[PDB]
Coordinates of C-alpha atoms and ligand atoms in Angstrom, one line a residue:
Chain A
X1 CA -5.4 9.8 -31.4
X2 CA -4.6 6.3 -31.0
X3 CA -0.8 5.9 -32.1
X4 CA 0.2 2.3 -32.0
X5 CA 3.3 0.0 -33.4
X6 CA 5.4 -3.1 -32.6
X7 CA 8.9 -2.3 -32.2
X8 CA 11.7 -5.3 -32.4
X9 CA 14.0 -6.4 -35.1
X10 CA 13.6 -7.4 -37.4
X11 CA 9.8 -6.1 -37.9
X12 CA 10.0 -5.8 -41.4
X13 CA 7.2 -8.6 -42.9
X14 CA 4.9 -8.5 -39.4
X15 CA 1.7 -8.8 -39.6
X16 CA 0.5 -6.7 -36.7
X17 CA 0.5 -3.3 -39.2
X18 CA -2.8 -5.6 -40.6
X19 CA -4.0 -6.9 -38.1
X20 CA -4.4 -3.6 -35.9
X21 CA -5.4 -1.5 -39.0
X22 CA -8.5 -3.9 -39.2
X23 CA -8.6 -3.5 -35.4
X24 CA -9.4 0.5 -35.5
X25 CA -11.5 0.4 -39.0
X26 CA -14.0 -2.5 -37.1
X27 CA -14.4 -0.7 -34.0
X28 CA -14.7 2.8 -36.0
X29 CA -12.1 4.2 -34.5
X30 CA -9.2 6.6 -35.7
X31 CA -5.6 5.4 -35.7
X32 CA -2.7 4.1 -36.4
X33 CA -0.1 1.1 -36.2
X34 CA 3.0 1.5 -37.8
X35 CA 6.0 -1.1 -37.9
X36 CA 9.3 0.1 -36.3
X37 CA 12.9 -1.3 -36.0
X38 CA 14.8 -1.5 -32.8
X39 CA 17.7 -3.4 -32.0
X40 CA 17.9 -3.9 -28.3
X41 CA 20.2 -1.6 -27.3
X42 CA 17.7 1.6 -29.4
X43 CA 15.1 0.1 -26.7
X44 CA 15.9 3.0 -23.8
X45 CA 15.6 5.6 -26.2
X46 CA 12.4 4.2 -28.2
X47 CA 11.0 3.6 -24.7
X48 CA 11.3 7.0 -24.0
X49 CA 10.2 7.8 -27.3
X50 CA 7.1 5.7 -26.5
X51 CA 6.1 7.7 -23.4
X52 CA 5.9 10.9 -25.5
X53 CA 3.4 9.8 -28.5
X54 CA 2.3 6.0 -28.4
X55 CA -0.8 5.2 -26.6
X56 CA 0.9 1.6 -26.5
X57 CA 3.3 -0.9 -28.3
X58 CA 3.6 -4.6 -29.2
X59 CA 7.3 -5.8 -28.4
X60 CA 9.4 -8.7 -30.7
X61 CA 12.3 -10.6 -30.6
X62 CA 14.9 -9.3 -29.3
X63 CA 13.4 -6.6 -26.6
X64 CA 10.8 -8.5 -24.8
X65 CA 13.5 -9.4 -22.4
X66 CA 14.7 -6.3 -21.5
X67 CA 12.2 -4.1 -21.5
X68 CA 11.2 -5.1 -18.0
X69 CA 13.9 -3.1 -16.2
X70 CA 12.4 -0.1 -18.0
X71 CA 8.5 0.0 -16.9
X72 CA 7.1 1.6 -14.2
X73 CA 5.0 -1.7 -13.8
X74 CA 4.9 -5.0 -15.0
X75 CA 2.3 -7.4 -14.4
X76 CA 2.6 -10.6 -11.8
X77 CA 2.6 -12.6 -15.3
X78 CA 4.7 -10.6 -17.0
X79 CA 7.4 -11.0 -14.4
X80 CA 7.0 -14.9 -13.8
X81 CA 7.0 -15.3 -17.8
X82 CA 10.3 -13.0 -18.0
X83 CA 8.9 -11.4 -20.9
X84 CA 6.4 -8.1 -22.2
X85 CA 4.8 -8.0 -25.2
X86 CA 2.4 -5.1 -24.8
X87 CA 2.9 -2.0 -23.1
X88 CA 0.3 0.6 -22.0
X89 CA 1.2 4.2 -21.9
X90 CA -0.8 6.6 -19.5
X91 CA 1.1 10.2 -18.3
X92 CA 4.2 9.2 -19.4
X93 CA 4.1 5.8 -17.6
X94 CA 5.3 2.9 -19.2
X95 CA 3.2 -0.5 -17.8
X96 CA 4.3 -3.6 -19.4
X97 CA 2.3 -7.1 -19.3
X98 CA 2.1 -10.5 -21.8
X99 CA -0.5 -11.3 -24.1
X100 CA 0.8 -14.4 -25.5
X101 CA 0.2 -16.7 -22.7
X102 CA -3.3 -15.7 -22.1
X103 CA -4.1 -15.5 -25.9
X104 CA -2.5 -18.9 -26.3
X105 CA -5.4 -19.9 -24.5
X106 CA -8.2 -18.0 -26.2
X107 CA -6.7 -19.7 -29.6
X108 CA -7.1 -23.1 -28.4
X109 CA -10.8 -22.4 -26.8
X110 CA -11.7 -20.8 -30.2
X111 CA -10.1 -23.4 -32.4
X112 CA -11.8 -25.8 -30.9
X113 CA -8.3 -27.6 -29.1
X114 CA -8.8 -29.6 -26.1
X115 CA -7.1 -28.5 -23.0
X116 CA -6.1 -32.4 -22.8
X117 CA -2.4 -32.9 -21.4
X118 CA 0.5 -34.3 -20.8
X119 CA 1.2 -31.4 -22.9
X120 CA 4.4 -31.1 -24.3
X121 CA 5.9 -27.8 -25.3
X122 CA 9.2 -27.9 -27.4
X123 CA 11.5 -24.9 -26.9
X124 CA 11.9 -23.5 -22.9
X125 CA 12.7 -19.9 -24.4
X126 CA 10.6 -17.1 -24.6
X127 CA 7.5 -18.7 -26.2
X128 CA 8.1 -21.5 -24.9
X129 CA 8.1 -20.0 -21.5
X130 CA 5.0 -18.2 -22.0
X131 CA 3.3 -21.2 -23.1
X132 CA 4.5 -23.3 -20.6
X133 CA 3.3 -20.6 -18.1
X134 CA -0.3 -20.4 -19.8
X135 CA -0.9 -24.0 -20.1
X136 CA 0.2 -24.8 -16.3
X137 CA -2.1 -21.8 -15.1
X138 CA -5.0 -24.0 -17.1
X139 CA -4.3 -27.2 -14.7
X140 CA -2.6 -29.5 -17.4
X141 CA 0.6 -31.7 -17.0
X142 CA 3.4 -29.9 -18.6
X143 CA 6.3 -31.5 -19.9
X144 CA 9.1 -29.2 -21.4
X145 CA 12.1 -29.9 -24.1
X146 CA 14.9 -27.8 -25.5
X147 CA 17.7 -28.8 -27.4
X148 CA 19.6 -27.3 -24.6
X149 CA 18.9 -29.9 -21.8
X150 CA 19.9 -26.7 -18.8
X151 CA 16.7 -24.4 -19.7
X152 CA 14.5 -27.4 -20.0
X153 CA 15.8 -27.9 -16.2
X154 CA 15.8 -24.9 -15.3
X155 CA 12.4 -23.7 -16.5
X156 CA 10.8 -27.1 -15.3
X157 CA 12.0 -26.2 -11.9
X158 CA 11.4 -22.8 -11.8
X159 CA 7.9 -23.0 -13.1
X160 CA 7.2 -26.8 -10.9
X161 CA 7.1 -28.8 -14.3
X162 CA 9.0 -31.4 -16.0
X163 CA 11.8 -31.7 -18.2
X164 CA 11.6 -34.6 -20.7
X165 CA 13.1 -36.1 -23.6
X166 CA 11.8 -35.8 -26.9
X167 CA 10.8 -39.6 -27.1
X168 CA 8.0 -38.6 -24.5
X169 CA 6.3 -36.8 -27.5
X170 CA 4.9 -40.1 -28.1
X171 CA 2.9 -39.7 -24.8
X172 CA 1.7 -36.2 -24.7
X173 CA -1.9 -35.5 -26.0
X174 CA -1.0 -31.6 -26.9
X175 CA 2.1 -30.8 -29.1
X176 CA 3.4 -27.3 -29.4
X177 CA 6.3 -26.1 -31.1
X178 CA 7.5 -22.9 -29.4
X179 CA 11.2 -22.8 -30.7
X180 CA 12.1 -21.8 -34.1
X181 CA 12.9 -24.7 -36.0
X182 CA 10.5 -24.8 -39.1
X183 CA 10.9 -21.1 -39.3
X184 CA 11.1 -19.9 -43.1
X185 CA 12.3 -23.6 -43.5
X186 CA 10.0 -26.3 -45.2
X187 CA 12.5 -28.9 -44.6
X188 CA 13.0 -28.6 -40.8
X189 CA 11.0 -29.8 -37.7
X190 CA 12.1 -30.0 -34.1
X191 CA 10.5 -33.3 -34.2
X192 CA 11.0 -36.1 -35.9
X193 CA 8.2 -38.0 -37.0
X194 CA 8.3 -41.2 -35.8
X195 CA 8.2 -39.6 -32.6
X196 CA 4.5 -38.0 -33.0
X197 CA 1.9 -39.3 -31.3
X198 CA -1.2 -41.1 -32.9
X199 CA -4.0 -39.0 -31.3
X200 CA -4.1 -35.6 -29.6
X201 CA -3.3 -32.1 -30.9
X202 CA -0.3 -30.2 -31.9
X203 CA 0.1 -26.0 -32.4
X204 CA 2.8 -24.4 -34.0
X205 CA 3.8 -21.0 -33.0
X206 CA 5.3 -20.3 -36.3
X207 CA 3.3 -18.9 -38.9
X208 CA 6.0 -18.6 -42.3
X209 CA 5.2 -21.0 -43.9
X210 CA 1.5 -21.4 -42.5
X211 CA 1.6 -25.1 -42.7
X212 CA 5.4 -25.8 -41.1
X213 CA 6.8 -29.3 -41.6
X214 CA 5.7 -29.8 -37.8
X215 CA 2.0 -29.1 -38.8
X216 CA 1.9 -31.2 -41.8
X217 CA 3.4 -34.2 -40.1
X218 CA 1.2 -34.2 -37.0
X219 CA -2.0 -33.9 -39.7
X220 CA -0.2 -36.9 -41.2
X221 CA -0.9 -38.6 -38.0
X222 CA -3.9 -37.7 -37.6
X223 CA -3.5 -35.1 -35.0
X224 CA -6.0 -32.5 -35.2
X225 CA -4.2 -29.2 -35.8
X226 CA -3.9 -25.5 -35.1
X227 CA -1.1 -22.9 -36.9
X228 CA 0.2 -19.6 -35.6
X229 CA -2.1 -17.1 -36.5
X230 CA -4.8 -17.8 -34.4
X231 CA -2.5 -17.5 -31.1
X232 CA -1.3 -14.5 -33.1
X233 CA -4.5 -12.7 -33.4
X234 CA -5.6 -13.5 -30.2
X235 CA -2.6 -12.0 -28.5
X236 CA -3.0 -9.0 -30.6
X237 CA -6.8 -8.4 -30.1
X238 CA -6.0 -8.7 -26.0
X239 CA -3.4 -6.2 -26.3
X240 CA -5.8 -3.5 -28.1
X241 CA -8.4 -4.2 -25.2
X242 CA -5.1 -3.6 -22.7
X243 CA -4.5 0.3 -24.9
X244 CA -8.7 0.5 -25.4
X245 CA -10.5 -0.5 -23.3
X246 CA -12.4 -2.3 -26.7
X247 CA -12.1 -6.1 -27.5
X248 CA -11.5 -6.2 -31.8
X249 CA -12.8 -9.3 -33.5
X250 CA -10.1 -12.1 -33.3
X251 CA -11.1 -14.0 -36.2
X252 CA -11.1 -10.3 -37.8
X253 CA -7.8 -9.8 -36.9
X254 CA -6.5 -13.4 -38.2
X255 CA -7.8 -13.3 -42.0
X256 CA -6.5 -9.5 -41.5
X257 CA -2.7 -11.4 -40.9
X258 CA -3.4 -14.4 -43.4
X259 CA -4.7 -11.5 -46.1
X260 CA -1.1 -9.8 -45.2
X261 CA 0.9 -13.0 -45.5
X262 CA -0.2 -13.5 -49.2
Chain B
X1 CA -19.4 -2.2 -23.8
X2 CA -17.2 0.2 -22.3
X3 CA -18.0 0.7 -18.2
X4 CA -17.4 4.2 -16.2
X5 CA -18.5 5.7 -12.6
X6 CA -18.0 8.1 -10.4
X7 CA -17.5 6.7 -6.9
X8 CA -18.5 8.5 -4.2
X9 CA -20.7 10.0 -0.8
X10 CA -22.5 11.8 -1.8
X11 CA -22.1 11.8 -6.1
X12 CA -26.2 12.5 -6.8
X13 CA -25.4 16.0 -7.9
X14 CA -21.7 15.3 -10.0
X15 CA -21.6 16.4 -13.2
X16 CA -19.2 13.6 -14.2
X17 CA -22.3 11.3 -15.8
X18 CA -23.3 14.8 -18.2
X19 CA -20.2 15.2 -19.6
X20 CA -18.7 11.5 -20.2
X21 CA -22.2 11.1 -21.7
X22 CA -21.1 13.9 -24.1
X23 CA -17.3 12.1 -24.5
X24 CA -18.8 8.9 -25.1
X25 CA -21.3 10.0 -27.8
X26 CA -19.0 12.2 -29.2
X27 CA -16.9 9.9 -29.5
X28 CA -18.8 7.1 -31.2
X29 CA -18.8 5.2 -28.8
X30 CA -20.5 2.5 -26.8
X31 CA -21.1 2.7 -23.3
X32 CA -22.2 4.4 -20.1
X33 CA -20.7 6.5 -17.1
X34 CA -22.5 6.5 -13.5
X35 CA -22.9 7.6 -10.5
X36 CA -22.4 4.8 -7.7
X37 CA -22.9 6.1 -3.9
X38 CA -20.3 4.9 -2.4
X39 CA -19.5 5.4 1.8
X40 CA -16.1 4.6 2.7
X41 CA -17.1 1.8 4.3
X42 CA -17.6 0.3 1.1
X43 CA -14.8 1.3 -0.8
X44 CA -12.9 -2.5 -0.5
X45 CA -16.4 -4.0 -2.0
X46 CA -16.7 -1.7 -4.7
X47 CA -12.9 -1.5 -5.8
X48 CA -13.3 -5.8 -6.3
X49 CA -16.7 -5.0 -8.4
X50 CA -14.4 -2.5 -10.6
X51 CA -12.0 -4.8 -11.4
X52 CA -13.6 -6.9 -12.3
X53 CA -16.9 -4.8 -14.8
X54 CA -15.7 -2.0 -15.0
X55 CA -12.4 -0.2 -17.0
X56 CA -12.4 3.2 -14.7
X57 CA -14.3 5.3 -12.2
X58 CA -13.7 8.6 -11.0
X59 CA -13.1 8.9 -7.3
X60 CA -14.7 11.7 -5.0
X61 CA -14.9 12.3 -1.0
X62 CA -14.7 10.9 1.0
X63 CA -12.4 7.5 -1.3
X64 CA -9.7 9.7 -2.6
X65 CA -7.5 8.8 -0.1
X66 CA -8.2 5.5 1.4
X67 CA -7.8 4.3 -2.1
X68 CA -4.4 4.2 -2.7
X69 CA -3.5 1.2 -0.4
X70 CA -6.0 -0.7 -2.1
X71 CA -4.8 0.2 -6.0
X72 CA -1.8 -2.1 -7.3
X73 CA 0.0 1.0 -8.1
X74 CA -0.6 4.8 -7.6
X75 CA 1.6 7.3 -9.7
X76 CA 4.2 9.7 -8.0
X77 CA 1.9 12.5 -8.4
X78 CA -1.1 10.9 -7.3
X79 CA 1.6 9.4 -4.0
X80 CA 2.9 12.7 -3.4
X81 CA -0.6 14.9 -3.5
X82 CA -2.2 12.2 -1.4
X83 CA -5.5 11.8 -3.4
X84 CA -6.7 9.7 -6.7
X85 CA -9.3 10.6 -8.9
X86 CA -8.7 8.0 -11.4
X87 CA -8.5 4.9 -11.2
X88 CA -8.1 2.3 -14.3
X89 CA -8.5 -1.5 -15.0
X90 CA -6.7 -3.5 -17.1
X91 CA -6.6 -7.4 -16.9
X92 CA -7.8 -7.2 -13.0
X93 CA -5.7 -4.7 -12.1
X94 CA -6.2 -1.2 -10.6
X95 CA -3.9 1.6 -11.2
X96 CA -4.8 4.6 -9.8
X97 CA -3.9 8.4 -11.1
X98 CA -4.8 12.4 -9.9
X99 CA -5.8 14.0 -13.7
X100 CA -6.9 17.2 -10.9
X101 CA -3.3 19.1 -11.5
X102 CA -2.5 18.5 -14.8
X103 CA -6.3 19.1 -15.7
X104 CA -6.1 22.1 -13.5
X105 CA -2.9 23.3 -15.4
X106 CA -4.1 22.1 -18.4
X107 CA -7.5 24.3 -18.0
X108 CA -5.4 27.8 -17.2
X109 CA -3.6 27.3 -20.4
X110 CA -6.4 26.8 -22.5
X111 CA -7.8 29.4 -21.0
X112 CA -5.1 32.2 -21.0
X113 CA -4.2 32.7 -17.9
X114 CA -0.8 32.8 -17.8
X115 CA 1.4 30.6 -15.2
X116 CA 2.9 33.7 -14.6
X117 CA 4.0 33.2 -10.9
X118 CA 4.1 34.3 -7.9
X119 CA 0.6 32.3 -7.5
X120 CA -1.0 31.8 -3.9
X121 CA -3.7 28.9 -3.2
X122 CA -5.8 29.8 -0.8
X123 CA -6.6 26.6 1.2
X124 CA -4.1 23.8 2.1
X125 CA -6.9 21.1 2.4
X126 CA -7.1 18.3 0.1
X127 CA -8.1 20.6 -3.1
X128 CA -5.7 23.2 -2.2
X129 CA -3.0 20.2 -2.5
X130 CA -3.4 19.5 -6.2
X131 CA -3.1 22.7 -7.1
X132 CA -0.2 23.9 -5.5
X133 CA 1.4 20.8 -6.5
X134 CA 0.7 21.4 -10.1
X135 CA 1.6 24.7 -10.1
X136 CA 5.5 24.3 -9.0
X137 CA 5.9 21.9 -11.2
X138 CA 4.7 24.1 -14.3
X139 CA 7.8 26.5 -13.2
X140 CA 6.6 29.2 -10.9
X141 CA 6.6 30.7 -7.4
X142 CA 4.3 29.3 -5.3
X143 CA 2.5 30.7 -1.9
X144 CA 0.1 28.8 0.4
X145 CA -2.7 30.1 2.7
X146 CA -4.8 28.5 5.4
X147 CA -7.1 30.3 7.9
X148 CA -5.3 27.7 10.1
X149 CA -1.5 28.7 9.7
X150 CA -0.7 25.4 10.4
X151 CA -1.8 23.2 7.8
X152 CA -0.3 25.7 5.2
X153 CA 3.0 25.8 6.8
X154 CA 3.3 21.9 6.7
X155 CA 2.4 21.8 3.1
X156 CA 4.9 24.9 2.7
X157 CA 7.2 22.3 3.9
X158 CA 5.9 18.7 2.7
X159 CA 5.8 20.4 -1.0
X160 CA 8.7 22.9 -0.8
X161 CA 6.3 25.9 -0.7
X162 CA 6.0 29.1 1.5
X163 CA 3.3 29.8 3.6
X164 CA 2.1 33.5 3.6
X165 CA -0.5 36.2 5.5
X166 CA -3.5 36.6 3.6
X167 CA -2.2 40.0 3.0
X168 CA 0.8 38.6 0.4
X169 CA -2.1 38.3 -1.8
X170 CA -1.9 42.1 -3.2
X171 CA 1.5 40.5 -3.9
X172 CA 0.4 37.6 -6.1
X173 CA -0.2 37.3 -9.5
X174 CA -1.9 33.6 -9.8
X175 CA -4.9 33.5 -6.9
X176 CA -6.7 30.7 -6.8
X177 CA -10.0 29.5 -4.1
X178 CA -8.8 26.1 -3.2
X179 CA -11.4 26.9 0.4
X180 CA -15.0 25.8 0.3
X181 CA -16.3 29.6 1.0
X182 CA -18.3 31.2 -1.5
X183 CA -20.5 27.6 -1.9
X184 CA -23.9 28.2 -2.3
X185 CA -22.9 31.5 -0.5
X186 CA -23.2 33.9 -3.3
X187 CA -21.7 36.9 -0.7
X188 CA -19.2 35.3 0.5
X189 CA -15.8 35.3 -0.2
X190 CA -12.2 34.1 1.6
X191 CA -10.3 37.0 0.6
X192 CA -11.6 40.9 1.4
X193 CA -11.7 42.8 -2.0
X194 CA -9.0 45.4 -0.5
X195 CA -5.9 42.5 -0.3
X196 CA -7.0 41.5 -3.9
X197 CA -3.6 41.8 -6.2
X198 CA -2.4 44.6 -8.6
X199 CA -2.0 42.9 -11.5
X200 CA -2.8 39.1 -12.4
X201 CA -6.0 36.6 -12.3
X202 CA -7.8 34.9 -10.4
X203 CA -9.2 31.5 -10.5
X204 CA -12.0 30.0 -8.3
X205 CA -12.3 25.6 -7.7
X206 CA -16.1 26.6 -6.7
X207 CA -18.5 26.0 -9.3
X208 CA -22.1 27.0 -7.4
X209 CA -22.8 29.3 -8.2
X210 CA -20.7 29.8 -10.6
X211 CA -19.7 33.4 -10.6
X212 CA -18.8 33.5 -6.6
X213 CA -18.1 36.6 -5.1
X214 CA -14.8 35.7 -5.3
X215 CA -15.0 36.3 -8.9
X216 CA -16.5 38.8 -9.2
X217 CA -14.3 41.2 -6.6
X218 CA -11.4 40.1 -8.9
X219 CA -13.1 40.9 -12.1
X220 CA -14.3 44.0 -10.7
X221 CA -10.3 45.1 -9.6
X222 CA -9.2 44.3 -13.4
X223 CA -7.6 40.7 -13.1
X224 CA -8.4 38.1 -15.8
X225 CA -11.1 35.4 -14.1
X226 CA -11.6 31.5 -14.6
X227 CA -14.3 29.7 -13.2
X228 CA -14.2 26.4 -12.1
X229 CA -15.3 24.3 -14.5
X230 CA -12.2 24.3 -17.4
X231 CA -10.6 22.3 -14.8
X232 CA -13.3 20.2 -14.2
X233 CA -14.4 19.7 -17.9
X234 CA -10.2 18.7 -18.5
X235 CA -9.6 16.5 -15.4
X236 CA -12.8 14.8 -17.2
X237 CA -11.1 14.3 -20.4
X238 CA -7.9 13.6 -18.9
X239 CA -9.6 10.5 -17.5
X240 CA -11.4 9.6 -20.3
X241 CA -7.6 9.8 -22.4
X242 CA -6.8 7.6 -19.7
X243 CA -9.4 4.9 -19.8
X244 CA -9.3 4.9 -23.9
X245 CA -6.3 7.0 -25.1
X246 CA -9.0 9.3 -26.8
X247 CA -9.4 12.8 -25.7
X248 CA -13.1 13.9 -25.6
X249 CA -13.3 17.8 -26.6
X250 CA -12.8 19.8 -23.6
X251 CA -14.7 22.4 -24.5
X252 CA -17.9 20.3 -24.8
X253 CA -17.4 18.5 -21.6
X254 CA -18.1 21.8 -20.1
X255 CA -21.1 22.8 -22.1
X256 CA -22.5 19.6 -20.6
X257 CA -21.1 20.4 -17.3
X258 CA -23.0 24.1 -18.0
X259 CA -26.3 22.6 -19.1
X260 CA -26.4 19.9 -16.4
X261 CA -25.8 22.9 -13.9
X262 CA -28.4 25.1 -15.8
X263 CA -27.0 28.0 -15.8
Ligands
NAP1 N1 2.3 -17.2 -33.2 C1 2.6 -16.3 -32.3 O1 1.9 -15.4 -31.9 C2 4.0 -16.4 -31.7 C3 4.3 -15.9 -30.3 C4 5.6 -16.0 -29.8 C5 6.6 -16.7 -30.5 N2 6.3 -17.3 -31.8 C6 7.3 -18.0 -32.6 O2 7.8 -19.1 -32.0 C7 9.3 -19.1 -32.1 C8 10.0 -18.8 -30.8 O3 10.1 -17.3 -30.5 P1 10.7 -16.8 -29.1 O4 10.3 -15.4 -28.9 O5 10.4 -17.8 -28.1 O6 12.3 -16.8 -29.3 P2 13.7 -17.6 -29.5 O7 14.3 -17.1 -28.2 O8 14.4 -16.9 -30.7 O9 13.7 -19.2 -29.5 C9 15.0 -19.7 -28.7 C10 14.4 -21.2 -28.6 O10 14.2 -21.8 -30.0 C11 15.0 -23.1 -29.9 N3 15.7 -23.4 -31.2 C12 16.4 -22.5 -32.0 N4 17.1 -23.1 -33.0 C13 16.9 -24.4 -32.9 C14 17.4 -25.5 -33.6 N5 18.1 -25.4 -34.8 N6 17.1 -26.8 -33.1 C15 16.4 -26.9 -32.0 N7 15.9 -25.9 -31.2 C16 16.2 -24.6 -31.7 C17 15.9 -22.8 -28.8 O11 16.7 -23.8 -28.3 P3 18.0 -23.4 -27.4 O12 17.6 -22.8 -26.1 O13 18.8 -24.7 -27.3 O14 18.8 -22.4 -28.2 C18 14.9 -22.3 -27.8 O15 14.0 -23.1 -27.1 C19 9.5 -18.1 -33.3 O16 9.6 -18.8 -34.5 C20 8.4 -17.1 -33.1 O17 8.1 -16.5 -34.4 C21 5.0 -17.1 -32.3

């Protein structure tokens, strides 16, 4: 019993597999969490596939997105984010809802982040989205960039926030890269430094490599600071409470990830 | 800690806490399944308290059906039937389910009986339901009965079924006691030995006593029996599947159900 996995693509190097595997063993239970490929046009058919023999999935990059318009129910979060990241599987029913925003949060609490705004979150795309979402449901100020001026806009309106330019870094109090500058690149940041501020927080979403440009220059300035996994572990253990029923230790689930990462 | 009940007036005599006491232990796992009295006036009160401590209850009379408005979302099966059994929370949320068919088709299977059609249900009330619904959708012929020809001839409609005389069921090869006679009425029966069918079985939703006269008449005549406890032991571990996505052995749900009954 208990057949799990996180279908996107790529999937190849995620950390989930690690994480979950650690998941069952602590709680004693019996199971599995495989990684599987699926481009987002495979997603009707592994959907379907889903229904027959997975107690639940964890969705990626691409099919997040689209997999809404394929559940029997998605969650009032879910919808306003745009975006599923877990789906539960009872009878053959697919019901989607997102882990990210509200594990966002648990990170923070648990890393010992203030919940101090204007917080400024860098990217108005998925992740970005679902941050956005999660910190304006905690009562902070949200500011939003992207390089793309229109879904700044857009999202600020849509969600009642406020689209800024980067310069107004220097006046937020929480920092969090949600776009995907930095990724697998030591050399690249989405914000230049002269444009940090001198006291507050910063988060990075991405977790390859652990301590992104972004990370290392906000440290630089003193900022104290928070990478990837923990946000990652969180939104993992919530998910296998959503299929279980049973919360798996977060921090459990993090050294899992940093363990699987080398 | 992982939170179950059974929600219901009355629930003091359910043998739902026995056997998710067995699917929790046998399981290795941590928690506790009980019985909560619960009068329909209180159904609103109590579904708020579930979801918020509590990740599923079973449902009995008289909240089966005033439940559904109240749930965020109610499968087809569970819409169509009329009834849920099962509810489930996750992140605040109620979803509610019916694990009576597939538990009740699931239970003939296990046990033999074949779904060989034509099958009649005896009873059109809210038992009689599930089961006819089920057993269309397993692929057979399917006729109802009601001492009041009128509620079996809606259903006959409402379901795409086809009411019958009690006499059609020398015809049938599937009979099942969806009627509350025979409970706690050890000579009493719904259908007179001499309309009993040729060939077939017979399956009774009566569990006290648990051989019912009913029973026994279609032993005696040579059709294969089933009492009613497979189904309850697999809706049971339907909903526990449900709840946790483990499946506690339903065989051992109803040894507990057995022992609990003491008999
Ligand atoms: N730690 C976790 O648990 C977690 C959870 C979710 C996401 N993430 C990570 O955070 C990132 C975002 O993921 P996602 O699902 O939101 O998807 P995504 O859709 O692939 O990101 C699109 C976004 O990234 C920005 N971006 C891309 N290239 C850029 C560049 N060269 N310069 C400036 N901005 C650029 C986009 O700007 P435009 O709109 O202008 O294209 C936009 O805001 C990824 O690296 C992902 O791994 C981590």
């Amino acid at each position: 019993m208990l057949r799990f996995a996180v279908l996107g693509h790529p999937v190849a190097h995620s950390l989930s597999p690690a994480m979950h595997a650690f998941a069952l063993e602590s709680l004693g239970l019996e199971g599995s969490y495989e990684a599987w490929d699926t481009p987002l046009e495979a997603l009707p058919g592994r959907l379907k596939e889903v229904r027959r023999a997975f107690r639940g999935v964890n969705l990626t990059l691409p099919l997040k997105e689209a997999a809404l318009a394929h559940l029997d129910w998605v969650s009032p979060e879910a919808q306003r984010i745009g975006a599923v990241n877990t789906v539960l599987q009872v009878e053959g029913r697919l019901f989607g809802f997102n882990t990210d925003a509200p594990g966002f949060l648990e990170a923070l609490k648990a890393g010992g982040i203030p919940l101090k705004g204007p917080a400024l979150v860098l990217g108005a795309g998925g992740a970005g989205r679902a941050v956005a979402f999660a910190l304006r449901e905690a009562g902070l100020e949200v500011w939003v960039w992207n390089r793309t001026p229109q879904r700044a806009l857009a999202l600020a309106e849509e969600f009642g926030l406020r689209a800024v330019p980067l310069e107004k870094a220097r006046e937020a109090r929480l920092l969090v890269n949600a776009t995907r500058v930095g990724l697998e690149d030591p050399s690249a940041s989405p914000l230049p430094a002269e444009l940090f501020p001198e006291e507050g927080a910063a988060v990075d979403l991405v977790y390859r490599p652990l301590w992104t440009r972004f990370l290392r220059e906000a440290k630089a300035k003193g900022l104290k600071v928070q990478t990837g996994l923990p946000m990652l572990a969180w939104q993992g253990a919530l998910a296998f409470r959503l299929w279980t029923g049973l919360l798996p230790d977060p921090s459990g689930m993090e050294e899992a990830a940093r363990r699987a990462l080398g």
